[PDB]
What does this fold into?
Amino acid sequence: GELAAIKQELAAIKKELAAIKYELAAIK
Amino acid sequence: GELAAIKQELAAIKKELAAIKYELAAIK
Amino acid sequence: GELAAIKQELAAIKKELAAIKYELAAIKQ
It folds into this structure.
């Protein structure tokens, strides 16, 4: 599961970047 | 080695995502 | 290969985080 874990962590990071970019957008 | 290093890269990124989400939240 | 793909995904993420930190900095001013 070492490679599996890494791919799931990378997947998760895209949802966190999305969350953040929407909050930045709102401020502008 | 090169494979191992990916876990430290991920660690770094998760810490900075946390920081950023908290900083944005705090502002709003 | 698997390493190649992952290095590009990490690059991509650091570029987006960089952009965000600069944009956040600008806002706090």
Summary: The helical segments of chain A are 2-27. DSSP finds one helix and no strands in chain A.
